[PDB]
Design a protein around this nucleic acid. Structure first.
Ligand SMILES: O=C([O-])C(=O)[O-]
Ligand SMILES: [Mg+2]
Ligand code: NA
Ligand code: NA
Ligand code: NA
Ligand code: NA
Length: 320
DNA sequence: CGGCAGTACTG
DNA sequence: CAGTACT
DNA sequence: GCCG
């Protein structure tokens, strides 16, 4: 990154808009930041700033003030509430609206939340693990977690396929959580396995808390045995084999990469989800799907790329 | 002007 | 439904 | 916030 002197100032404003609920402006900042981090050289001119995709008049103006002034005046008028809103929205299950409500009600600390806030079941678990969920784990621990799930699943049916996705599959040295995708090549024996799989992982003591228990998605908390272990976020998704490639693609990410790929599909009259890539998709004038297209056959991730007219990208090159 | 990805889960 | 979360 |  040739422009840290810019981005680290911009990230502060981005975070402020985000925790305050200004989602679209924060998205604009996030895109301008990544564009700046991918630039090959320091941006040294206003029109050079305007050069880059994701940088407009407003953003170029801010970069010009930073190079001349070494500073961004807007940083000095960020509301005093933002550090507290960030503290609160780092509770799993509390977002901008809950954080703002707690702030309005006078709460200022996690002690205030603990002693006085009404918490959902999910939020109470997030608060209990507040520090642990802000920490990343070594890649090698994510391996142990994936393998724990795989062995529990394969105890029931040796034919079950289990793949760690997310940042793990993209090759990162540390992971904020573990994402495990499960399917069965026969296209049938994936059904109704959650109850037994989750029960098995609980009997161990491995699964410590459940955040979400849906028919296809589980989100929760695990901890490996022994001393020196922290609680870690674990997501599991079980999908039919017919959807494996799109589910693998979705779950491997990155989030930015998925959104960019899905935006591309839309421009070409298609739609991409975790379930399928569809074509001949009819939408209204607001980009809204009003008529469903046809599912396209996507036996492998490469097929999704190919049908989108894209060169194949290995997971490591999807880390956007 | 208005979209900015598409979906699952919770209560 | 609105809110939050996942990639 | 940016961009079509
Ligand atoms: O945890 C993550 O950030 C992921 O899965 O990409
Ligand atoms: Mg993940
Ligand atoms: Na530009
Ligand atoms: Na949160
Ligand atoms: Na009080
Ligand atoms: Na996850």
């Amino acid at each position: 990154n040739h422009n840290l002197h810019i981005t680290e100032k911009l990230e502060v404003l981005a975070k402020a808009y985000s925790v305050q609920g200004d989602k679209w402006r924060a998205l604009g900042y996030a895109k301008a930041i990544n564009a700046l981090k991918s630039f090959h050289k320091p941006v040294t001119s206003y029109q050079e700033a305007c050069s880059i995709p994701g940088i407009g008049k407003r953003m170029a103006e801010k970069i010009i003030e930073i190079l001349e002034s070494g500073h961004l005046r807007k940083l000095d008028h960020i509301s005093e509430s933002v550090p507290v809103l960030e503290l609160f929205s780092n509770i799993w299950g509390a977002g901008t609206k809950t954080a703002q409500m707690w702030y309005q009600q006078g709460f200022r600390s996690l002690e205030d939340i603990r002693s006085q806030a009404s918490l959902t079941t999910q939020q109470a678990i997030g608060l209990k693990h507040y520090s642990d969920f802000l920490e990343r784990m070594p890649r090698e621990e994510a391996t142990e977690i994936e393998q724990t799930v795989q062995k529990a699943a394969q105890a029931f049916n040796s034919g079950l396929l289990c793949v760690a996705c997310g940042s793990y599959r993209r090759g990162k040295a540390t992971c904020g959580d573990v994402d495990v995708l499960i399917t069965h090549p026969d296209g049938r024996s994936h059904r109704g396995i959650f109850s037994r799989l989750l029960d098995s992982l609980r009997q161990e003591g491995f699964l410590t808390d459940d955040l979400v228990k849906g028919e296809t998605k589980y989100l929760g908390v695990c901890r490996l045995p022994g001393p020196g272990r922290r609680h870690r976020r674990l997501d599991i998704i079980v999908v039919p084999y017919s959807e494996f490639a799109c589910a693998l693609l979705y779950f491997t990410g990155s989030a930015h990469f998925n959104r960019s790929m899905r935006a591309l599909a839309k421009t070409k009259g298609m739609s991409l989800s975790e379930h399928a890539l569809s074509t001949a998709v009819v939408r209204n004038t607001h980009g809204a799907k009003v008529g469903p297209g046809r599912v396209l056959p996507t036996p492998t991730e490469k097929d999704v790329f190919r049908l989108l007219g894209l060169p194949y990208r290995e997971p490591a090159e999807r880390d956007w």
